[PDB]
Design a protein around this ligand. Structure first.
Ligand SMILES: *[C@@H]1O[C@H](CO)[C@@H](O[C@@H]2O[C@H](CO)[C@@H](O)[C@H](O)[C@H]2NC(C)=O)[C@H](O)[C@H]1NC(C)=O
Ligand SMILES: *[C@@H]1O[C@H](CO)[C@@H](O[C@@H]2O[C@H](CO)[C@@H](O)[C@H](O)[C@H]2NC(C)=O)[C@H](O)[C@H]1NC(C)=O
Ligand SMILES: *[C@@H]1O[C@H](CO)[C@@H](O)[C@H](O)[C@H]1NC(C)=O
Ligand SMILES: *[C@@H]1O[C@H](CO)[C@@H](O)[C@H](O)[C@H]1NC(C)=O
Ligand SMILES: CN1CC(=O)c2ccccc21
Ligand SMILES: CN1CC(=O)c2ccccc21
Lengths: 534, 534
């Protein structure tokens, strides 16, 4: 061994770069490869492990991002562009990043970040996902992995071995294998790995908790605004198949056989697939994505709900929660009457249209049941109530109530559950007020961006961030976000009986119970009974 | 003509009695017959007009009450016993009563009271229906009629002319014919007759508004806690038939023919019919009565809803409303967990049982939709919330929301609608607190009982009564409860657009809008869509 930035791993030697952070410095190992490039004839295939290398792998700069749809809905606007790829896109994108305290620890808590983006987009290299502040502040080794998205990660022709489906989840698993196998050399403790992720990354986390092939590779889990059972996070094999055939149909492919389709898809340039990807969705919908995980009988051995019911999943601790206004983004982008630069007061006709888009799988009785549940009939033309009410519909149905269902089932068999409700709107949000506490805007607090003076958060936002980071890291380390014997207010355990949770904002902690139960009894029990009967 | 108490009518001469009232006196003509006795072979038949008589009909004492079930659920208790017959019961019961100011007016406003009692009970002769205070205070001629109830009034074998159904409504109509034809001789103006009634009497009123054969006999209408479209106030001819056959089955009748059944029923003593009457109901239910009006194609030429929709009804003014706690009585008497001498805090199991009884016509999805709509899921074991919530279910479903549906339909074609919500609980109510503002307890205010010092109301209850009586009488006289040009607060018209109504209590009038719309959109639009689809 020669120096702090040189680490010898089972895959070979790796050279990092020293990086400044809040008037100090740490080590960063960026762009380490964990799989072979899934290119050419390996497109759609399950990843192969990276063949070890001779020499020293230069890990001083961020890798490429995976091939993905790029949001151009608001050119030059930082609110949307902070989510897009900031590196060149390539099919050769299976790399991970590690931020390691200086001096190098010996056996410290490890946190592994799985990006969101609907399984059609996302990047490990975004500014808001910079691990240095958290690694430095809380003395954890901070990994961020990557995984194939879109058709590249999730095209599913079940029964074929060339495009089986789920390969993007297999990418995440392989990165988690490589951390298990190598993080000791960077000073991380492989027995104390926490996986954490937002939205589709949150759901991915839940998916590794359920899947037998992933459970042993990590110790505990954090799910932010995402659950494995979300209505958008998986499709049946039959539906997967249908969409893969439709995709081939949009590219003038031979459709006689799987082999024929797959060969045709493999000839196409990445951007040809990306350009027609939204054409395969079966309904006019929002919060629905084309290529997502498939309930295949392998990665997921039975239905998600039967695994949840029988306790067929990893038993450990989990920490998880939601933001107050999970739906607004999807309404802005996809529903009539919402725009970025107005208050988006919504007529009754646009309300009804929104409901339809929001609950694509519903018969008319179903739509009426939603509309009744969320309409104030003493004031049914209030444009603000309609706007806010639709915002709640999208969030409740897609994020909050699935998550609350996951929590209630998990908590029966698990070993400790901590639940939060993040409802602070950041003082410098570039998005309009009506969107509230938007999908994804807790991430900046989890990653410590408010400690950076130049980014212009308030002091109370710095303090909130420090507190979240310390809850997240203490939980990763011990299985409990609370420091043993400290004087702070205590985040209580969520239990089947009492169902407690806390708000996460700049005000003194307040504990509550039964998060959105009224609406989630509607979405989790009544509405699905109504649609089964009709 | 000889004196004030002698009136010559088209049916013959009649002798009244002078009666004291609030330190003054008026004339009362009690027990005037308006039909032939519907006895023997006329049992179940449509009434015949009373054959005129020679001599002077002694009208100094109250007539008999019709044969009816008698409530013995609380022996000696005045709360329940004030509703029972206070005269001998007889099949010979078709009489009316008239209170006439002294000195005799020439052409004054006439109010005709139709008693409630579920179409199975009721009496014109009850203390709370004493017309003297209103006649005297407001200078109206006050009639109260009677009509056959139970099987005697409503057994229905459609196609037979011996028991056609609806004969009790035909009794009311005949009394209204006789008032039309004779009230001029008592100083009433037949061109200014208001029909008014409570509960089944309220529904009866609505029924005379709809029925072509009744419309011309009165000018305007007041409906208290009752509407023609109530779920309990009518049955189909097929259902009528079924219950009449079941009734005969309970009495070991020949069932081969209508003639056979009817002859067998006509041999039975009244009390034999009354003793088995509750055995014919098709469900385990509350707020459902055995022998009610039947949608026959004659009295009602089509379905009530198609008449309401097409405007096939009398166009005039109406004044109508509800009490705050319409359901409590029926829960007390029929639902498990409610008792007279406890607070009746209701377990979740008794809640569910109550829902079932309350909505007998509902499939399980239906029951779930009710339960969801009325359960606070943050506090689903609060026994008070469950009790109150079930009280609202029974009242909303049976009284308030049918009435609100009637109002909204009527108001499209009618000539002025005044809507109230009576929510004052009388200071001397003998019933327990949990029952709130009980079905029927506005009646005492409408009839002026609070002006009688001995009955122990408060002064503000005297004032409320005087104000209600004057709203009721001014509306009967002019079509508007408000006195032209006075300084009091004005009861506004209910309109399709603004839907205003007022509270009726001891506090200063407050105007509101859209009475129980949230719950009535559930009962009037959603739930029936749900049960049609399943
Ligand atoms: C998490 O798991 C451990 C058990 O593996 C729990 O601690 C045990 O609690 C039981 C019952 O209180 C005791 O009988 C054992 O002695 C405990 N074992 C240890 C090693 O402490 C703990 O209760 C679980 N936590 C939760 C929240 O379920
Ligand atoms: C009740 O009916 C009368 C009509 O028969 C209404 O009074 C009429 O109103 C219209 C339109 O305002 C006028 O053109 C007529 O000259 C009025 N006729 C009379 C005789 O006044 C009155 O509007 C109706 N009231 C309600 C509440 O609908
Ligand atoms: C590694 O390559 C980067 C270019 O991305 C370069 O800036 C850096 O100097 C290289 N480091 C070494 C010492 O190889
Ligand atoms: C009428 O009969 C009643 C008995 O109910 C009696 O009290 C009254 O004196 C009689 N009146 C006359 C004068 O016939
Ligand atoms: C909600 N944030 C978080 C996130 O993953 C994302 C993807 C697209 C647009 C916005 C996003
Ligand atoms: C509600 N009041 C009014 C009413 O008509 C009636 C009948 C039976 C028991 C109580 C009653």
């Amino acid at each position: 061994d020669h120096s702090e930035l040189l680490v010898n791993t089972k895959s070979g030697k790796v050279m990092g770069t020293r990086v400044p952070v809040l008037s100090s410095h740490i080590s960063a190992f960026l762009g380490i490869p964990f799989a072979e490039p899934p290119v050419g004839n390996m497109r759609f295939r399950r990843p192969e492990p990276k063949k070890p290398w001779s020499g020293v792998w230069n890990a001083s700069t961020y890798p490429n991002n995976c091939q993905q749809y790029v949001d151009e809905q608001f050119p030059g606007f930082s609110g949307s562009e902070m989510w897009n790829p900031n590196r060149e896109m390539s099919e050769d994108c299976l790399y991970l990043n590690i931020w390691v305290p200086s001096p190098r620890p010996k056996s410290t808590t490890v946190m592994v970040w799985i990006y969101g983006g609907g399984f059609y987009s996302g990047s490990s290299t975004l500014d808001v996902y910079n691990g240095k502040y958290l690694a430095y502040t809380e003395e954890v080794v901070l990994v961020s992995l990557s995984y194939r998205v879109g058709a590249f990660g999730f095209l599913a022709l079940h029964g074929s071995q060339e495009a089986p489906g789920n390969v993007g989840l297999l990418d995440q698993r392989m990165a988690l294998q490589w951390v298990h196998d190598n993080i000791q050399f960077f000073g991380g403790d492989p027995k104390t790995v926490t996986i954490f992720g937002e939205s589709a990354g949150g759901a991915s986390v839940g998916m590794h908790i359920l899947s037998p092939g992933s459970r042993d590779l990590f110790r505990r889990a954090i799910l932010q605004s995402g659950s494995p059972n979300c209505p958008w996070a998986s499709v049946s094999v039959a539906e997967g198949r249908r969409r893969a055939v439709e995709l081939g149909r949009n590219l003038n492919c031979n459709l006689n056989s799987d082999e024929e389709l797959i060969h045709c898809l493999r000839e196409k340039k990445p951007q040809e697939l990306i350009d027609v990807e939204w054409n395969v969705l079966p309904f006019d919908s929002i919060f629905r994505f084309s290529f997502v995980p498939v309930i295949d009988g392998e990665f997921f051995p039975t239905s998600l709900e039967s695994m949840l019911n029988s306790g067929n999943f990893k038993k450990t601790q989990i920490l998880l929660g939601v933001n107050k206004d999970e739906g607004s983004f999807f309404l802005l982008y996809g529903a009539p009457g919402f725009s970025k630069d107005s208050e988006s007061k919504i007529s009754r006709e646009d309300f009804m249209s929104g409901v339809k888009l929001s609950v694509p799988h519903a018969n008319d009785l179903g739509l009426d049941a939603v509309t009744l549940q969320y309409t104030d009939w003493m004031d049914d033309n209030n444009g603000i109530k309609n706007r806010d009410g639709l915002d709640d519909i999208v969030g409740d149905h897609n994020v909050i109530c699935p998550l609350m269902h996951f929590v209630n089932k998990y908590t029966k068999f698990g070993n400790g559950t901590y639940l939060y409700f993040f409802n602070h709107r950041a003082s410098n949000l570039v998005w309009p007020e009506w969107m509230g506490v938007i999908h994804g805007y807790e991430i900046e607090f989890v990653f410590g961006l408010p400690l950076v003076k130049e980014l212009n958060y308030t002091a109370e936002e710095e303090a909130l961030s420090r507190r979240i980071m310390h809850y997240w890291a203490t939980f990763a380390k011990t299985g409990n976000p609370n420091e043993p014997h400290s004087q702070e207010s205590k985040w209580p355990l969520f239990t089947t009986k009492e169902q407690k949770f806390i708000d996460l904002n700049t005000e003194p902690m307040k504990v509550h119970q039964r998060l959105r139960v009224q609406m989630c009894v509607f979405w989790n029990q009544f509405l699905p009974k109504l649609l089964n009967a009709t």
